[PDB]
Design an enzyme around this catalytic site. Structure first.
Site, PDB file in Angstrom:
ATOM      1  N   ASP A 155    -101.998  60.505  49.917  1.00 25.53           N
ATOM      2  CA  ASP A 155    -101.906  60.208  48.894  1.00 25.53           C
ATOM      3  C   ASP A 155    -102.144  61.235  47.932  1.00 25.53           C
ATOM      4  OD1 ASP A 155    -100.195  57.539  49.570  1.00 25.53           O
ATOM      5  OD2 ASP A 155    -101.894  56.270  50.204  1.00 25.53           O
ATOM      6  N   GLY A 198     -96.667  57.221  47.984  1.00 26.43           N
ATOM      7  CA  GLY A 198     -97.249  57.908  46.183  1.00 26.43           C
ATOM      8  C   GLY A 198     -97.704  56.695  45.554  1.00 26.43           C
ATOM      9  N   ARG A 281     -76.999  55.033  49.246  1.00 25.78           N
ATOM     10  CA  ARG A 281     -78.000  53.567  50.478  1.00 25.78           C
ATOM     11  C   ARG A 281     -79.474  54.092  49.980  1.00 25.78           C
ATOM     12  NH1 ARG A 281     -75.006  50.471  54.002  1.00 25.78           N
ATOM     13  NH2 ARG A 281     -75.023  50.937  55.929  1.00 25.78           N
ATOM     14  N   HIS A 287     -94.544  54.773  57.022  1.00 27.44           N
ATOM     15  CA  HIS A 287     -95.439  55.551  58.034  1.00 27.44           C
ATOM     16  C   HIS A 287     -95.088  57.180  58.939  1.00 27.44           C
ATOM     17  CE1 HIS A 287     -98.778  53.029  57.579  1.00 27.44           C
ATOM     18  NE2 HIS A 287     -99.529  53.556  58.597  1.00 27.44           N
ATOM     19  N   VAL A 288     -93.647  57.595  58.383  1.00 32.42           N
ATOM     20  CA  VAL A 288     -93.307  58.590  58.684  1.00 32.42           C
ATOM     21  C   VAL A 288     -93.430  60.055  57.928  1.00 32.42           C
ATOM     22  CG1 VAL A 288     -91.059  56.908  59.890  1.00 32.42           C
ATOM     23  CG2 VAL A 288     -91.228  58.724  57.619  1.00 32.42           C
ATOM     24  N   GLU A 619     -97.896  94.394  65.343  1.00 29.84           N
ATOM     25  CA  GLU A 619     -97.692  94.730  65.836  1.00 29.84           C
ATOM     26  C   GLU A 619     -98.115  96.376  66.029  1.00 29.84           C
ATOM     27  OE1 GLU A 619     -93.808  95.355  63.957  1.00 29.84           O
ATOM     28  OE2 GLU A 619     -94.832  94.673  62.681  1.00 29.84           O
ATOM     29  N   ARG A 645     -98.709  87.427  80.865  1.00 32.90           N
ATOM     30  CA  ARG A 645     -97.015  87.900  80.445  1.00 32.90           C
ATOM     31  C   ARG A 645     -97.356  88.294  79.425  1.00 32.90           C
ATOM     32  NH1 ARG A 645     -96.554  85.339  85.625  1.00 32.90           N
ATOM     33  NH2 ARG A 645     -94.365  84.106  85.904  1.00 32.90           N
ATOM     34  N   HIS A 651     -87.474  89.143  64.714  1.00 32.35           N
ATOM     35  CA  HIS A 651     -87.363  88.541  63.893  1.00 32.35           C
ATOM     36  C   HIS A 651     -87.226  86.824  63.314  1.00 32.35           C
ATOM     37  CE1 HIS A 651     -86.528  92.545  62.823  1.00 32.35           C
ATOM     38  NE2 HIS A 651     -86.149  92.321  61.470  1.00 32.35           N
ATOM     39  N   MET A 652     -87.573  86.020  64.853  1.00 37.25           N
ATOM     40  CA  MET A 652     -87.757  84.713  64.510  1.00 37.25           C
ATOM     41  C   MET A 652     -88.600  84.269  64.151  1.00 37.25           C
ATOM     42  SD  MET A 652     -89.745  84.067  68.145  1.00 37.25           S
ATOM     43  CE  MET A 652     -90.226  82.213  67.210  1.00 37.25           C
TER      44      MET A 652
END
Lengths: 738, 735, 174
Positions: A155, A198, A281, A287-288, A619, A645, A651-652
């Site tokens: 908040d 809020g 609508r 609470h999400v 890189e 590994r 570029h992702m």
């Protein structure tokens, strides 16, 4: 430093995302420099009872919680602590484990109760010794208790600082719902209304609506002007004419009107049918907003304050007042708790009266800027009332296709339109400038541009050195008197080439401004760039998903090579938020001994429950120590304990949906950049060195630094500035992984 | 078929992937040389005409495959219902020669096309009666063929398994649960959700099964008598059995014993008067219709988009109207006259009780998902468990595929409910030789659905080299049954365990294998656990890369996806993301096919879509590597387009388990345990070591003794597959 | 082979060793010239000479590297020839110099020293000169006028004499 004493961490009251990242750094810091650290479960509820809620914390207990929202400690309603009727028992459990230092992570009334606990600390101690329960030497040994407060409420009710822990993560959940509706309301003509979290502070309703480009916001601090029911229906009818079939109405949890009567979302639903007649609508995000994985901005802020609070504990002398640590700029500072509560009392004072203007300016400097920028960007004055100055201002995207660059053009044009200038668009960057592609764009053309990555205008990493005469031809046939560049290091080099062309070509004497827009923070003179949080949230989230593949195939370490050229902003900050065991950047010299010391550290950590490993690398960290070198060395030096590994991201990292931070960031600096352009435009002599500046960030406010002075603190060989601000977090990052 | 004209339109309900349907419909009609026409505003655009009937090209249906909803505009007309306005709508189609209609709508708008195909002879004869059309037009454009496409998350139309927008709306429901599953663990509480679907309730069944809820309210099967007392007991049982998070999934029109809907407010008051738990009601509004379409829906819409075009030119002048839908691995077509009857049958079956038959009418998918959830969320007491004195152990062997933990949660809870004690062989075969085996119970697999990677631990180590430790460790824990949940490494192990039958007698117990890999190279199985997670991740990463490819004009990104030698992630990733080329190992290619793709990609730069998405298998060839495609596209494409290269890597796997694999692992694992209980009644033959695969629609247990021929041990892929039939369907969707 | 951008070792090396192809930087080549060499190489496997030698400059192409020619020749020749690759290191500039270089280093160094004793203009651009081979004799060209016939980007001269041998070589291959 200090050691021997105990530290007590707790999370009560407002519990937001990234709080587990806070206790992760609080526990691991008190072990690295001090003695024992203790968990206080259920917040203040565990202090009253105790016994099992006060347990010792180790380095292996705050590992797998970095990627978990909320808090692992917990909290509840504690009526036996706020009143001095059972608080004596709460002050009786800390003396058992020798806890003489406290650390509260709240942000609402929990920080107020910590100050009352310090003032009564010298009163409850004499009573516990009088009742015959503690020892006489203990009432003097632990007679002084130093506490530290940490904000953690979405908040943003704590009006002390500007950005708190949980604000960026809660904003992510708001935009993620808006971006979903943005692909459905295009079927049937409708208009949605959202209710954000809020209640007492409408900071969440301001930056979230500014990011998604809403039409009208209902703030609990700044009330709507008398007659808003008839003005909003006309405003909503205007968007129907601008081919904007989607309208977003952001309402706060307790948005009030002229009086103290709250404006509910059901009243707005009953209002769009009495003059408009559209479909509506109502949607309420409960609470999400407080849930979900913590964002990269909060994982760093909670980790930075998760270290500063422990520093502000042992270093704080027993005679200093309680301090609430908050991050703001290069170095974090400590804010007194008694003064922070004073600002909350003054905010509620002006909110009760009808003097709402003094309550908005008191909330902070970022709230006033976010309110003034959005009001000039969402409200469009009529076309017949635009004070046109007969001037053409151009916007261009030059560099890498960083996210948020589509939103920077939206804020640049509509601000310049209201400022009184017709707007031209240079497509395909500098390659298009020499090729033409200059087209006028207006308000309806940048409609809904916030939400798309890359560049609708087009970007190009081509320096305007050779193709210079072709640009001058397109500068006169369209009569461009101002140019705004949105890009990274290529925009800084291009503006320097345009400085050496004023002696040659004459049309280049027009004012110009560059806005940082890169996914590497390599822009010299600026500490932040558009697309940084987008890539930072992408790397940390992807690195977290890679950790799940490691947390399973046990005894596995993943080598990840990030991008960014030479600026290890994505490597260092990405390792601080994703919990990487090591991040090898170019600015940090490393040899075979330091590389082997990390292998020795990894072999010891495999014996613990955390049998995983995440190591990052820029890189171009070293021409010899390549990415496969880390893969080849860690494998042979651990063939009997841990395999490894390699995964080159690529570029992702960039692209995709622009981050909520990058949404508001690019919409704010681009608005102030045109304000400089409009001010420099009004001069009824244009050849100067102050007309080719770059709108950078120093600490909190913005600064216009010309490129004539940025040549000193830059490195043209490595594409990065000489002295960087995030290099101060270098020791803070490596001490969180032992 | 060629020469005819097709007119696509969208009217009625909407869903994610609707733009993916019209993308394949337009591109398939152009490939066969047929005129495609957009019909805006649904049926209202036909009556108006003028600008609502516009021709489509290959450049119009691009860059919209990843956009949710529809770009045409799902509208609800009113003048088309009358024949007076229908005559103007019929003459509007005769102007452009539109003699074929493709209605991709929700449910109710599909009936209007049926009345248009019967009045075609009456309306066309009326235009020539008025003299506005020539007599050759009523003879050349004599008959109108129509086709329908299910495009609504309501899923009221039966006859199929999954419709367009189901997996996407399911994704939006699970994505909200994941934001709570990693949040509500701080304080005990219970969340009540409300999904869409008034007379279907399918979204509430699979989503609750995926997230592992405690009670579902379906409009078909109502809750039992006294559910207000049974649901409060179930919510109280998990309170003391280590479960601080309860999920209550309610439908939009969930009814009780009568026709009175059970609102989410009564459930909120039910858990606050006798339970006292902090409960917040969350009604999922139109967010279920939003978001980017999932990879399963983009492939579904692309497959039905082509199947709808071939169902129009092949349609005889006397054939009924049909609605295309997916039927397992090879889709079919269903008549429109019979699909409406099933909707009216379910309604009447729901009216006046008769809920016992409404579940059986919805098909075997609903009955299979209902039985799985009822036997997984309802736990009978331990004293009422008929203990068979048998030890059943689970194990994960191979790559850490996503959704592997969701399969073990079902494999253990069903094994306990059957009457056995469950074990956990950690670290796969590596821990099997080390001895990492511990007994686990019902409360041990709590909340496992929603956690990617692996909890037990998996290793690619195979026996034989450590078989002496496997044979000794097995005869100690009294292991009588084995269940392996892995990839191709689990298949190679079961083959070695079959050869060690006489030399080692303890390996004569029935062993069932469950596929769980992102490569989807398991022989005898069409799908695999974790394949949809990587498929939804590769296409999403390609979208984030195509965004930068669209920002910087004229750019091609060579993307190398993993999967060993199997081209499942490359082909399906190339179809769901609209890639220009997907080079796999099963389809060879030389430098001529590579250069033909560059010439195909060069002509694409002249249009508005100046981008390029090309994918390559992890090991499609030892010569044409990833850098080979990057070097050729950079040199041969000099001056026309720049190109880079990026390798995905292990980022495709180990992510958030996709809702498909959340139920895929939970469904076949319960059936794999039933195969164990069916054989744990009395071993010496080859029908004991089999794998659980997908043939057409149901499952089948193929023994590994006969699977040795239909597999390629040199490449770890099966000889014949199923998705190879989509190779021509994917190549025709790239110019 | 080494040599930077100058294909002298690749052009002259492929002519003496009898290589079927010699891709240098001075001659551009695409995938059609690369495929024509493979289609002509497949016909060679039907004769007595069932071998193949192809040379490549150290930096003849930015994309058609040494592994690119090895990868294309291996797949396009699968079943008609099995090709390999090998990179020559610093062994080319070996130990014992060739007898031609023994006299080359002695013949022109004496004339270079005779030019020193003759001159010592005084302070211009021709006092600094080179010793090149025109046709049969030597020539002293000042380093100032040697800028229009050279490419500083690739460290090679613009027009080269041995480029007129590229019309040949081919006629001795296929």
């Amino acid at each position: 430093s200090g050691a021997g004493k105990a530290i007590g961490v707790l999370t009560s009251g407002g519990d937001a995302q990234g709080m587990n990242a806070a206790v992760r750094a609080v526990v691991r810091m008190g072990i690295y420099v001090g003695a024992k650290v203790y968990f206080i479960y259920e917040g203040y509820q565990g202090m009253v009872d105790g016994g099992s809620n006060i347990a010792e914390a180790d380095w292996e207990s705050v590992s797998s919680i970095l990627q978990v929202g909320g808090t692992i400690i917990g909290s509840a309603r504690c009526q036996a602590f706020r009143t001095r009727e059972g608080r004596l028992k709460a002050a009786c459990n800390l003396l058992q484990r020798g806890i003489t230092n406290l650390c509260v992570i709240g942000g609402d009334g929990s920080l107020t109760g910590a100050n009352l606990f310090r003032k009564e600390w010298s009163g409850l101690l004499e009573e516990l010794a009088r009742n015959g329960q503690i020892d006489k030497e203990a009432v003097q040994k632990y007679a002084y208790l130093n506490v530290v407060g940490m904000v953690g409420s979405i908040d943003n009710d704590f009006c002390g600082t500007d950005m708190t822990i949980g604000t960026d993560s809660a904003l992510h959940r708001i935009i993620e719902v808006v971006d979903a509706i943005m692909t459905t309301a295009q079927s049937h003509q409708r208009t949605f209304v959202l209710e954000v979290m809020g209640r007492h502070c409408g900071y969440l309703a301001l930056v979230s609506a500014l990011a998604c480009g809403a039409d009208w916001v209902f703030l609990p601090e700044s009330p709507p002007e008398e007659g808003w029911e008839e003005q909003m229906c006309v405003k909503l009818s205007e968007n129907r004419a601008r081919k904007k079939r989607l309208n977003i109405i952001i309402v706060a949890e307790g948005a009030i009107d002229t009086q103290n009567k709250p404006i509910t979302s059901e009243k707005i639903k009953e209002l769009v049918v009495t003059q408009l007649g559209y479909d509506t609508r109502v949607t309420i995000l409960g609470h999400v907003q407080r849930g979900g994985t913590p964002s990269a901005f909060d994982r760093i802020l909670a980790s930075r304050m998760g270290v500063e609070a422990v520093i502000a504990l042992l270093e704080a002398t027993p005679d200093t007042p309680a301090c609430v640590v908050s991050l703001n700029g290069n170095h974090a500072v400590r804010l007194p708790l008694m003064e922070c509560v004073q600002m909350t009392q003054d905010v509620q004072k002006a909110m009760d009266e009808r003097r709402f203007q003094d309550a908005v300016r008191l909330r902070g400097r970022s709230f006033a800027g976010n309110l003034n920028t959005y009001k000039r960007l969402a409200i469009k004055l009529p076309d017949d009332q635009i004070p046109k100055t007969n001037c053409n201002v151009a916007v261009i995207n030059v560099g890498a296709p960083a996210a948020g660059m589509n939103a920077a053009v939206r804020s640049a044009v509509r601000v310049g339109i209201a400022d009184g200038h017709r707007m031209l668009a240079i497509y395909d960057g500098f390659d298009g400038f020499a090729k033409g592609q200059i087209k006028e764009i207006g308000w309806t053309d940048v409609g809904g541009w916030t939400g798309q990555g890359g560049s609708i205008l087009g970007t190009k990493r081509v320096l305007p050195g050779k193709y210079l005469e072709e640009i001058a031809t397109q500068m006169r046939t369209h009569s461009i008197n101002a140019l705004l560049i949105i890009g990274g290091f290529e925009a800084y080099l291009g503006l320097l080439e345009l400085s050496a062309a004023r002696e040659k070509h004459e049309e280049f004497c027009v004012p110009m401004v560059m806005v940082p827009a890169t996914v590497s923070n390599n822009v010299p003179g600026s500490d932040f760039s558009i697309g940084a949080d987008t890539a930072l949230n992408t790397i940390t989230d992807t690195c977290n998903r890679i950790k799940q593949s490691a947390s399973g195939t046990k005894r596995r370490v993943f080598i990840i090579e990030t991008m960014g050229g030479y600026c290890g902003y994505l490597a260092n900050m990405g390792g601080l938020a994703a919990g990487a065991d090591a991040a090898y950047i170019f600015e940090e010299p490393f040899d075979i001994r330091d590389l082997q010391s990390n292998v020795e550290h990894l072999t010891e950590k495999m014996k613990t429950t955390i049998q995983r490993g995440l190591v990052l690398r820029n890189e171009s960290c070293s021409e010899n120590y390549t990415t496969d070198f880390i893969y080849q060395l860690y494998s042979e030096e651990g063939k009997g304990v841990f395999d490894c590994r390699k995964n080159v991201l690529g570029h992702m990292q960039q692209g995709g949906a622009p981050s909520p931070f990058d949404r508001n960031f690019g919409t704010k600096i681009s608005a102030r950049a045109m304000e400089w352009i409009t001010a420099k435009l009004k001069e009824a002599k244009f050849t100067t060195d102050d007309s080719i500046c770059v709108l950078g960030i120093s600490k909190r406010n913005v600064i216009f630094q010309p490129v004539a002075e940025l040549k000193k603190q830059t490195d043209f060989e490595h594409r990065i500035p000489k002295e960087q601000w995030w290099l101060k977090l270098r020791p803070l990052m490596k001490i969180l992984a032992k």
